Structure formats: C-alpha cells, structure tokens
Design an enzyme around this catalytic site. Structure first.
Site, PDB file in Angstrom:
ATOM      1  N   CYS A   1      -3.408   0.405   7.447  1.00 34.69           N
ATOM      2  CA  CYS A   1      -3.346  -0.104   8.819  1.00 34.69           C
ATOM      3  C   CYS A   1      -3.914   0.931   9.790  1.00 34.69           C
ATOM      4  O   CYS A   1      -4.564   0.575  10.775  1.00 34.69           O
ATOM      5  CB  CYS A   1      -1.904  -0.442   9.218  1.00 34.69           C
ATOM      6  SG  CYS A   1      -1.129  -1.734   8.238  1.00 34.69           S
TER       7      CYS A   1
ATOM      8  N   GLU B   1       5.396  -3.077  12.142  1.00 33.45           N
ATOM      9  CA  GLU B   1       4.144  -2.338  12.083  1.00 33.45           C
ATOM     10  C   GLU B   1       3.218  -3.353  11.445  1.00 33.45           C
ATOM     11  O   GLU B   1       3.382  -3.699  10.273  1.00 33.45           O
ATOM     12  CB  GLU B   1       4.223  -1.102  11.199  1.00 33.45           C
ATOM     13  CG  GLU B   1       2.905  -0.312  11.232  1.00 33.45           C
ATOM     14  CD  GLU B   1       2.587   0.400   9.925  1.00 33.45           C
ATOM     15  OE1 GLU B   1       3.522   0.722   9.160  1.00 33.45           O
ATOM     16  OE2 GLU B   1       1.393   0.636   9.658  1.00 33.45           O
TER      17      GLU B   1
ATOM     18  N   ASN C   1       0.787  -1.233   0.000  1.00 36.02           N
ATOM     19  CA  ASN C   1       0.000   0.000   0.000  1.00 36.02           C
ATOM     20  C   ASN C   1       0.821   1.287   0.000  1.00 36.02           C
ATOM     21  O   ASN C   1       0.319   2.346  -0.372  1.00 36.02           O
ATOM     22  CB  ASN C   1      -1.084  -0.005   1.098  1.00 36.02           C
ATOM     23  CG  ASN C   1      -0.527  -0.144   2.515  1.00 36.02           C
ATOM     24  OD1 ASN C   1       0.651  -0.430   2.723  1.00 36.02           O
ATOM     25  ND2 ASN C   1      -1.388   0.078   3.498  1.00 36.02           N
TER      26      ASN C   1
END
Lengths: 474, 474, 474, 474
Positions: free
Chosen positions: D283, D249, D153
């Site tokens: 996210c 992450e 992304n």
C-alpha cells in the site's frame, strides 16, 4: 587485605593509598577501597569528557540495551551482592537483597522511559501574524557529564536512580558512593564493566572528604550534580554549583496527621512500619505524630504494643532493629533521648543501648519546646505530639524547616485534599505511610528538604536540556 | 410575516419556500425561516470548499481575533437574543440569556485553546539503531468542511461548542440548527456576519428533514459531522458517515447511586436540581435514583417536598417547569406516567397536564419491569428504584443501553473511585449532580450515548488530523 | 524635581533619600526615584508574603482578568510611556513605543497560557504489580515570592516577561528595575496599580547597588530569582541563591556561520539588522561572522555599504544608531576598537565618537588573538573572521564561553541540522538573524549565557513546583 | 493433510469443514485451516468477553511481561515461521524472516509504550471562578473486545501491530488473518499459546468470507474493528461499524514528485526500491512519478537500467520479483498494461508473464487519460507522468482518491515544506521513498486511504477511551 579497585576508563585501578572498611555490626574488616588523589579525579573526568560525543552519537535503542544487560547481571548476582551490602551498612540480609532487585527494576524502567524521548514543534503564528511561516523544531539533549553521589542507607539503589536516567539520555557518569558503602558501590560497577559499555562512559570515584570533597563538585568538567545526603552538605553543594543545574534530596521530618475519624488500627500499623524501618535511618519516614487529643490515648497504646513486637539484633538474622551506622550517630540519637526525657516527655518503652544498637523507643507528651520535636534523629525513636485542631496540626507541621512528605489519616477525603494543599511538602499520602513508593511517581521536597523533582521520568527531564532549530517555510 | 434569511457566502438569502415557527408556550407566530432545496445546499458547500484554503492560510492569531469579536457582539445583544430564544423553545428568560453568555464563554475559550496548537518531533533511533538520523516533524491540520447540527434544548450554546473549535483549527462551517430553534440559530449567524469573517467560511442551512435530512450528511463535500440529538438519528448518521469522522452526543438515563452513608439533604437538593432543570429536557440529567433500602424512605420525603416548591408556568415568569417543546413530546411523557402508575408505582405528587404543560412528578417503588425504569422521557418525571447492595446498583445501572454520566452520593471516596471504575459511563460525579459542567473538562458517553470525546480541547483534536514530514539529518 | 514613588502594599511611597536620573542623549534631568533602605525592602517582602495565600486562593480565571486589564491600560498609554522610556535609555521613540506594545502582548499571552494549567495521574501498576490500586494525583503549585530584575535595554518588556508568568501561577512579585530605567519601571507599576490587584501582590523596589544589591537576593523571603543582566552579576546571584531556583539570561557572542552556498544578499541584510539594532546593545545579536573564505570578500562589501546607510543621531529622530547608555560603556567599546585596529584588523568604516555616540564600524580580517573576537562589546562594532572549513567554524564558535544563539546561512538544510546539533547554543536560526523572536518559543543559553529555559510556557513551569497526593482505590 | 487448528479459549480446535491452502509459486499444498461456522464465532466472542474483566484487572507490568515472552518465542522460531510464511504468500525467504523479527520488535515496543499510560488532572477554575474547588481526575480505559484483521502481504506483521497495542491497554483479542496467510497467522497464535496468556484473552478465527465475513464485523460483542485490506471492503466495514470506533488502512497511489534541482541518482535508487519491493504488492509504495519535463529523460534512463538488474524468480531464491498472490491479481495487472500500451504509453522493458509471474515493467509517457495513472495495480508496473510546473504536479497528485503518503525529491527544503502542506496525504518523505518506516512514527492516510491514526503510540490511544471522575475539594 581484600583490596577493591575503581573502574576508570575501562580499567580497574588501585591508588597509592587506601581506606579500610569494617562491619558496623561486628567491627570485622570487610576489605579496602582506594583513597583517590585530585590528579586521579582529573583523569576520571578527562576520560568521561573524551567518551561523551561517541556515547551521545549512539541511538537510544543501543543505550537502553546496555542498561538492560546491567540489570540482568545484577539480578544474577543479587545474593552475592546482597551478602556484602548487608554487612557493610548493617542492613538486614533479605532487605539488602531487595535493594539490589529494586536497583535492577529502576535501571530497566529508566532505559525504556528514556528511549521514548520526543520534542515539540511550535507555531510562530500563535503569537504573531507576521511570523506564521516560522516554526521551531525542539529536541532534547544531554547536559554533558553528571556527578552522581549516593547515600549510606541505599548506596546501590540511590545510585542507580541517578545513573540509569543520566546514561539513557546521552550523558556520561562519574559515580561517587559513600565511603561506608563504597565496596557495594564498586560491586555495582562490576555489572557495568561486564555489560561492556564503552571506555569512559561510566567511572567510579572513592576517597576522603577532606581531600576530594569540594574538588569533585567544583570541577569545571562537571555539568550537573545529583546528590542524596545531609542538608548541610546539600546547601554547600548548591553554593559550589554556582549557576550549574543540580538535584538534591536532603533531610526530612515527615509528620503523620491523625484526625478524629481515622481508622486507628490501620494508622498504628502504617506508623510503626514507616517510623522503624531500617532503625529509622530513612529520609522518607514518619518522624512525628500530630494526633487530635480525643483519639490520642487509644492510638498511643496500639503503637506501644507494636513496638514491643519488633525484633532487635544482627543483620544476618533479618532483625527489624539493627545496630546504627556508627558510634557518632548513636551518640547523637542518645542526646535527643536525654533532652526529651529530662524535659518531661513520657517514654513508653525502655531506653537501652549496647554498642551502637539502640532499642526502639516511643515518646508520648512531646512538646514543640523539645529538640526531638524538630530535629531529624536517624534512629529508632518516635515522638507523639497532641493537638486540639486540624489548624494547629497544619501550623506545627509547616513550622518545620523540612518538607519532604506527609501522611493524613482520616475518612474525609475532600477535607484531606484541602489540608494537603496547605501542607508545605512534595508528596502527601492519604491513609498510608510516607515512601518514595513507585519510582515512576514524582519525588521531591520543599524548603530545606531538597531541590529538583525526581522520579524516573522527572530525573530524565532534569538531566537534559533543549535545542531549538528555527526556520521559515516557503 | 417577519421573514428570516440564511447567511450564505457573505449574503443573506431567502428561499422560494418557508417554514413558520410558533411559540411552544402561547402558540403565537414568531416568524419564518427558509425551507432550502438540495440545490441551495449544494451552493453552501461549494462556497465553503472554495473559501477553505484561504481560511487555512491565515495565522492562528487572526482566526482567534475573529472569534473574539463574535463573542463580544453576542455579549452586547444577549437580552435581544435571549428574548427570542426564550419564546422559541419555551425556556425561562433568565436561563435563555445565560445560554447566550455561556456561548460567548465557549467561543472565547476555544479561540485561545486553539491558537496554542503544537506538534511533536519523533526519533527514529528509539525504535531502530539504523534509523537514528531520521526524525519526524508532525503538525496538526484541519479536516476540511465540518457540518455542525445543534439541538432544540440548546440551539445556540450547543452550536458554538462545535463552530468555534472547528473554525480556530482552519476548518470551514455549515451550520444546521433545529427547525424549532432555527430563528435563534439565525440570530447567532448575525454575530458572525457582523464580525466580518471572509465569505464562505461560515454558512447556515435551514429546511425540512424529508427534503434535506439525509442529503446534508451524505454529501461528499462534508469531511466531519458533529451532531447532538436523538439516538435513532445518531445511529443513522454514523452509518451514513461511512468511514468519515464523527462526533455524536445522544440520549442519556443518568443514574444517581445513593449509599447508606450519604448526606441525604445535599443528595436531595442535587437530585432535584439535576432532574427538573428545563422540565427534564436535558441529556445530562439525573433520570433514575438507585438508593439503598435503609435510607430510601427518608430521601424520598425530602425529594417529595422539594418538588412541591418548584414553580410552574410561563417562560417570561422564569418558572422552573415550563411547557414541553411540542404536543408529541407531552403525549409520550404521559404514556410513561400511565405505564408506571398502572403497573403499581407510587406517585407522590399529582398527575396534571394543561396544554403541553406537565406538572413535576415523583414516582416511588419503580421496578425494572416498568418502561419508566429504562426509557428517556425528556419530561418532568423522576423514578426511584430501591436496591439492597452496591453490587445490585451497579448491575442495574450498567444494564441500560445509555452511558453518558453518573452520580455517587457517599462519604467513602476510595470506595466511590472503585465503583466509578465499574460504571459504564463517560463521567462520574461524586456528591454532585451530573452536568457538562466546565466546558474545559472532557464530555463523552458510553454505549448508545454517543461517539467521540467533547470538551473544548478534545473537540479541537477531534476535528483535526495530522501531517507527518520525515527526513534524514546529515 | 519630578519625584517618583515606589508602589508598596497598595501605596505609593517616597524614601528619605533619592536618586536623580538624566537622559543619556542630552544630559537633561528626567526626574528622581527613591533610594530604598534595607528596612524598606523588608517591608516590601513582608507585605508580599502576607498577601500570597489569598492571591493563591483566587481562581486562575480571576488572576488572568487582572493581567488582561494591566495590558489594556498599557496599550492606552503607550505613547505616554514610550515618550519617557525613549529618553531614559536613549532608545528611538518608535522603538520605545514598540517595547510597550510587546509588553502588553506577553502579559495577555501569559494570562491565557497560565490558566490552562493541568496536572497528571500516574499508575502504580506501571512499575509494580503489587501497587496497581495506587495512583498519584499531581497538580502544579506556585513557589512563593519571586524577585524579578529587568535590564536597561528592555526595562519594561523584560520585566513583564517575568511578572505576568509568575503572577498567573499564584506567586507574588517584588520588581527591581535597573536604576537607569527605574522611571519607566515605575510607569509600568502604575498600570498594575490602576488595574486594582490586591495590596501586596505586586510591589516595586529601587535603590543603590551597594546598599540593597546583595540584600534583595540573599533575603530568606525570596523563593525564586529571575534576572537579566551581566554574566558577572549572574554568576554571583547563582551563588547567593544557594539551592533556591533561579532563571538567568546573561551575555552573548552570537555567531553567524556563512557557508559557500549561502544567499549573500539575504545574509548581508540579516547580519546588518541583527548586529546594529539598538547600537549593538542586545544579548541576542549577531556579534561575530564566521564566513568561508571563498565568499568572504563579496559578503564584506555588501555589509560595508549597508553600514553606511544607517542613520546616526538622537532618539527623537528614530536614528538607527543612538548614543550609548553611559560614558563607561563607550570607553569600553572604544578600547576594543583600538585593540583590533592596533593589532592589524581592517576597519571598513570610519572610527568616530562625539560624546557617547559611536558611529557604526565594520572590522575585517579579525583573528582569534584579538579581544574583539571573544569579548561582548555592547556597541556598534562588528568583526568578520574568515574560515576554510565548516569544522573550523564549529570549533571557533564553541570555543567561546557564551552560548545563547546562532545563525547558519546555507541552502543545505539536512547539513544545517547536523551543524546545529554540534553548536553549543540554545537556539539556532537557519537563514535568519538571531532573536528572542516569538515569545512562545523557548529562550535559553548554554555555558555562561544563562540558567533555565524561558519563553512564556517554560517560564510558568520554571516558577511553579508540583504537589503529589497518593492514595489507594478500594 | 497437515491440518491446522484455531486457538479458542485456551484450546486448539478443528471445525467440521476445512479450507486447503496452496503455495502461490508452486501450486503445492501447504496444509489446511478450519472453515468456521457462525456458531463457532459466537463461542470465540463469548469466551473473550468472559475473560476481559480479569485481564483488565491485571497490572500493566504483568500484561507487558506476557507480550515480551511472545516476542522472545517468535525470535526463537523465526526461521521455522519464516520458512512457511515465505511459501504461503510467495515472499522471499529472507524477507519472510524479516517480517517475523519486525513483528517481535513491534510487540516489545507496544508493551513498553503501553505501560507508561497516564492521565490528567483538570482545574474547574480555569473556566469559571465559582468552580475553582472542582477538579477532574481523567484516566484511560480499554474499549472492550477488539477484532483485528490482517492482510496477505504482511499476515503476521500487520497482525501484531494491532494485537500488542490492544492487549497492553486491557482489551481482549479476536484475530482474523487472511485465508491466504491463515497458516502463518496460526503459527503466530502458537507463540501466544506458549506464552501462557489466560484463556479467552487471545483467540483466532478462520473461515470463508461468504459465511462469516459480515458476521464477525456486525456482531454486538465487537467494540472496535482494526483492519488492513482493500478500499471497497474498508468502506463496507465503516458502514457496518455503525457508530463504533474503527481503524482502517486501505489503498494507495503514492506519488514521487521530482523537481528540477533533485539528485537524480538518489531519486532513481529510492524509486526503484519503493516501487518494486515485493513485486509492487504494498500500500505504501511509489506508484506514480510526477517529474518536471527538463529532467525527465535523464531520470527515466537511470530507472530503466535499474529495472533490468532486478532478479526474477522463486521465493526460495530471494528474488526481487516473485510470482503474484493469485491468478485473478495477475489478470488485473495485465489488463492495466494493455490499456496503457494500447493508448500510446512507451514501455521501456519487455512485457512478459509465465504463470502468475509478471516481469517488472517501466512505462514512460503516461497520461491522466490512462487507467494506469490512477488505479492501484498491486503488481510490478511503474508509470512516469511528465509535468511542466510544481503547481501542476500538486493538482494531479491531489486529484487522486487516495492519500496515504508522498515523496518529494529536491534540494530546496523550505519549498518542500510548503508543497508538503498542500499535499493531501498523511506522510511526506523528503528525498526518500515512502514507507511505514519506524513504527513509532504516525501512520495514516487521507481521503479513501483510511480512517484513524496508526503507529504504536497512536494505536494505543485509538483503542482506549477515557474515564473522568469529578469531585470538590474541602
């Protein structure tokens, strides 16, 4: 005549009266600068105070971008600016161009150092149980209007080191360069004008000391006074400041302590460089050698020979020793040379003066009873004082009213650190000559050498205050 | 038998099964400790998780007061606790009492270091003009439940250095001491019980490795694992931790680099102290000497003589060299002595073992082809390896899989700083033996020697996280 | 008479002349204090300068232990000391005992805050590639001798907040309490004497302003002047300091800004507490209310009623409103009450004075044309000024020459933060009255309210300088 | 085919095998990237380890200059790079160009943040009187070789946020972009190649997961693993790391807590933006709304209408909702839509899918018994969950295994700060949608959302270690 103007509120302005500037080496006229009136100073301050709120309202990133552009312009015109700076203060051409480049480096560094401004959050429960739900959000803020005054030996560099750190934080500027060096100061102002900073955030002031000297400092519009110059004027500025914050870099009489286990060749080289740079016209310069008797003779001979290799002459020829700033200065240095020579010191190089050009001189056998042992000359003259113990060297050193920096030449570091703790100075260089070296490092002086801690980061903290917002969590 | 209990949720508890502990020096029974079941471990964690919120809710000042009381109680009973600790791990009596006092010092220091917890306020306009009205209020927070595991050589001291730093920040504790040293660990627990900390904030765990070893680490209730022990177990814990934060202090093979200009008497004294303290059973201990050939013979003779002055005997007599922790350990150290002696090394002191008491031994002419040159013994045996250049010393040193600390003996500091930058270790001591020395200083290791930075202040940062609250100003 | 002595160089000393002190509430004599001569002041300074080197030579830990003992002694004698402090400055007994306890808290906190003193290491390669092997080791150092001068409203507390922060760093102390409050200052000195600090590190000074006032400040032996008192004297001290560092806490005219969405009951309670504490004799006190017209009437009635519930009387009875410090003070407060009442303001409580006891008074409809709107009274009188916009409130507030602290009562925080950025003060309290609250938080003032940032941590930084040692790595 | 190469040791290299990449929106072939072998990975690491020492030896200023040039090149080719990035991951064109610009901003900021690296000097006398002459000079050092792995992304942006912070400190880089996004990753590599960084300091890796997936992480040459991707893979990487440092992450299920006093229009706008950006493939995105029942109906209608205004279509048209990354992803999102719809939830927008393009959908009446209430979809689907108390909202929120960020919409800030302390997340946004917003701010997650604290400054501290040099002063 080539008439220069002040940059005030986004406009270039002439005054009714002017001051002509000449070249210290040739006597030839360089041009003229305005001789401002107190009313004209009032306009500069009013304009600055008017522009401050909107300047403070911009983001850190926008203020840094402006400063970065100023630095790029200076880099573009370094030869152009360096040419005139060399002639105005009788500084070697190459060295004059170096000052401009270093001014650009400090401006860029202050821009990036200042945009990384951050506060702190404190806990009430650290001090008292009952206040555990209470916290304090503390953020930095500008002090307002800063008056920056630069010296003649570094009219551009020691202007930028005040201006950039002040501007990035949100303060506005009123810049007063030395009269002998005002043309170069106005050349620096052109870069700020071309960069396009809002009207009133950066302004210049030029004039006569007896007309605007005390006036520019005593003015209520001024929130901080950042100055580099003489101790006498510095003391006076401190008093005129009242209870307002200040930053002062005054005189120096840096000593080079040489122990018996020192590397004499390295010592000799560093002392020569530090003592004779720009003909001795520097605050941070080796101004007295305190050497242990057993190694004195050998060190003095090395220094003697190196002095004879120094070039003497004109600024355009990049000579090591150039003519002094003015006649009054040479007259003073001359008077110190006579006192020492007449009192018994041993001159190891010839005493010669032609115009305001004094040839470099080394004096051996200097005693604490001589003026040259304590007074800052600001000329190419170096005194050697012999000692019999490190304890004696420390006493003589701390006996001085000055306390800028010091050098210690030895191969025993733990001992050098111990001596360093005893020396009443701001910075101590081990096996190296004194210097402002690396503008990120702190720069300060003890006793009569100054007030406040300089260096990029420290200059920003000095020219800012704090704002604390306290509230209770539910 | 004198049966000890675990402190769980404000209660002292026995288990259905127990483990008997004996004195390493005499073989006499000291008492017994519980042999917990996995269900009993589940209760400790459930109790701790239950008490955490209310513990975190107290002010920093209240949490520090509790810790200060624990330290005062320990100081009161130092002789009482020291007496038993001396017998449990065969540590000299005086030294055993010193560990308790040092535990009190670290507990008090962590209490005061932790109550001065502060956050930061960041500016959005530093990175982007459009975000100038956005700020971030960042405050520290505890990670939750911390599992602290101490070693046998410092069962009390290296427990408190984990517990106090964890508790002051707001975390809860589950303490697992080594089985051989669990009685002393339970004596430490009494001070926490007497201080009156809320039920569930501090608890202890004791048992057999094959029953609760992996279980206590893999448990989901655990948010952080702080451990001191062997490299093998440490590697395993790191893997079992998953992506959870950890702190590990593992093995060491600290080297003492000796240059040609070193002070050999001072070097000899520091090496003897660092190498033989507690019979060599320390992670931070001089475990190999890399000395320049030209000064090797002289240094080896000084070290040889000093080894012969060391006292050998029982804990109650405060002997320098006491019996090793167990039979398996002595057997291992013995095997390293045989390898070196059979491969050609020169033993300068007699090889002797009575029970598990191994007399101190110095080995000269050690080569990198011998086991003693690389393996951590944890016994009174010191290898001397000769080199011909500083570059060679640096290569052999960094060749090791360990990287805790290092010593450099020389009179050239600028050079020592340069060598230090090349050494793959956490701490470098110039002209002094290695040590955790001054618990305020950072303590860490490179490569296989560990993970995480210890020292009071750093331990607090490690066992805490951050909480960022962002909002826009209007 | 009960004759008190000064503590000089480890000895208690009387002077040839003395000054008798009486109780502000009863007129009864409390005892006497020495009236020092300039020669006696010279001895205090000579003794302090003599003891400084050895004091600086002690470790931080030893200096903290001394301060901790002083605090323990004060806690022991709090009732004893509180009894006399209550009578000397006409402060309620319970409140007088609280000041002593708070003095102990600040002394302990400064001891622990100061022992965690640390420097920094800077990289030459950050600014210039050629200087990458050059680093700067920067450590903090004391400024020398500190002259601490406390006020009458907090003669003990605002003495310790200067003394402890100065002593822990390595500076020596010369303490000058207010004449009215000198007995309590000498009672504080006894704790320092009993704690056993070396001779000369802590000394006291008492006398008449016309004899030693300027003398104690102008003296070359003094390196820093830390003072709390009137603005006029503060301005004068700043000028007499020259270029020497200072710390000043002067007057205040704190405003309480009340918006239309404020919680009026909470606002009323906080304003009453902040405005009338110690009869209004505080620098950090709500001295003017700037309330939005639409909620003014309702707020004024709550405040009116709460004023009538305040107790009025003697110190021994713990009355809210006690007699003012002296006749001259009451006369001044009286003149401000007449100006407002004669100019049209609306008094909502009776005007009454018996001796130097002035009953609490609330004034509504105050205009910027009245003296009470700008002048600091230091008496139980509160002015209410109505506004029609937040912008108007901000202008009136910043229009003052003072800028210590401010309060904002509203339910809109993002807006409160925005207003806070515009207020020319050091600290802003949201939905709470002003206060030095939590001595770990920064405490400062803008414009004429002071110079320097206080608060434990900041006081330590202020009374210390830096020492930079630079060298090249090989 | 347009065959792309990896940048290895200053050379562009093809592999024997390759992987063809297609456009997620059209199915058209974009080109191909190398399918590396484990031997080829060995060469990348060997080259990096070989170049590290000389890279670390450069000054900070030189390393920053290199990074600044990389950023300038990226700015020059933003349209060029943006064009291909838009097609490779089906991201809107304008948004694709924004990612490149933001990558340049982070690279420049990390360069300047990292050159201001400084250490600390600690005092031995703070902890022990006997150690007062002992100090510790602590400086930062790189960890070695860093393996950086970016997500699909943000293949370029979330690569630079790892690379720049690692390089400025002195570490070397091995960059592994996602296979779907490897072409853009190789376009980023061209800027590094053109900037002229030494051979081996920056290298790229591309290939198949089953061939080099575990291999690149388990490799002994790797000193730190910085990764952004799925929770499952992240857990696995943590375990494979052993005791080596990491930065992860992972997933998120950010909740937006809406209280009764919230501004519903502002709330609705922020939720729409945060939830549907890049079709929900983020996210840090609002993934669940926990709204108080009394204001639920009104909020849901605003959100419903705004969803209908979103554009749906192709990347070249800059549509709000673009096709999902792959078929497997759309299939998964589809399965969550069925579960909720079949279990009783109320869909307020039509369910439609053409190819891998799923139209945006709002689901009301979602219960904790539905998969959509807990699972991270990574698609344009938003669930609304109604609550009756703030306490219930906090319980449901913390019940999740994820803990990245959270939003609180209310007009009561003190209360919002209290709730924020209770939420198990890294960052809390008051009256604003979640976001990494301002890369200078800290970025982290609790529980299963990650390990380590990101943000420029924190990333630099994470990818560096410390070196402590201890010595005694004489």
């Amino acid at each position: 005549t080539k008439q220069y103007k002040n940059y005030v509120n986004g406009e270039w302005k002439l005054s009714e009266n002017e001051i002509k500037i000449y070249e210290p080496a040739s006597g030839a006229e360089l041009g003229s600068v305005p001789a401002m009136s107190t009313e004209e100073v009032d306009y500069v301050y009013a304009s600055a105070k008017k522009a401050q709120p909107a300047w403070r309202a911009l983001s850190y990133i926008e203020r840094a971008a402006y400063l970065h552009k100023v630095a790029d312009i200076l880099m573009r015109d370094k030869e152009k600016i360096g040419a005139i700076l060399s002639k105005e203060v009788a500084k070697g051409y190459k060295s004059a161009v170096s000052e401009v480049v270093r001014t650009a480096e400090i401006i860029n560094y202050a821009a990036e150092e200042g945009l990384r401004m951050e506060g702190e959050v404190l806990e009430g429960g650290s001090f008292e149980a009952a206040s555990k739900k209470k916290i304090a959000v503390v953020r930095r803020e500008p002090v307002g209007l800063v008056l920056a005054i630069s010296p003649f030996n570094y009219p551009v560099n020691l202007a930028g080191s005040k201006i950039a750190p002040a501007l990035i934080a949100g303060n506005v500027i009123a810049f007063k360069p030395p009269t002998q060096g005002s043309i170069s100061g106005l050349l620096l102002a052109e870069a700020f004008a071309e960069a396009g900073l809002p009207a009133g955030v950066f302004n210049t002031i030029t004039g006569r000391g007896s007309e605007i000297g005390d006036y520019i400092v005593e003015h209520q519009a001024v929130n901080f006074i950042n100055f580099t110059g003489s101790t006498g004027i510095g003391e006076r500025i401190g008093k005129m400041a009242g209870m307002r914050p200040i930053m002062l870099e005054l005189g120096g009489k840096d000593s080079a302590i040489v122990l018996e286990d020192a590397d004499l060749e390295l010592t000799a080289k560093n002392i020569i460089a530090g003592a004779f740079g720009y003909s001795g016209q520097r605050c941070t310069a080796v101004k007295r050698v305190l050497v242990m008797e057993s190694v004195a003779d050998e060190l003095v001979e090395k220094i003697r020979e190196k002095v004879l290799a120094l070039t003497i002459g004109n600024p355009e020829d990049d000579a090591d020793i150039t003519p002094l700033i003015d006649t009054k200065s040479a007259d003073y240095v001359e008077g110190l040379i006579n006192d020492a020579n007449d009192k018994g010191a041993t001159a190891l190089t010839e005493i010669k003066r032609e115009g305001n050009l004094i040839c470099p001189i080394l004096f051996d056998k200097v005693t604490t009873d001589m003026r040259l042992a304590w007074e800052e000359p600001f000329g190419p003259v170096l005194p050697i004082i012999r000692v019999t113990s490190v304890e004696e060297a420390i006493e003589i050193s701390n006996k001085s009213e000055y306390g800028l920096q010091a050098s210690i030449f030895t191969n025993d570091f733990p001992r050098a650190f111990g001596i360093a703790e005893q020396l009443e100075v701001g910075t101590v260089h081990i096996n190296n000559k004194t210097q402002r070296g690396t503008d990120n490092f702190p720069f300060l002086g003890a006793k009569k050498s100054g007030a406040g801690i300089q260096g990029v980061k420290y200059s920003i903290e000095a020219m800012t205050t704090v704002k604390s917002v306290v509230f209770d969590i539910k």
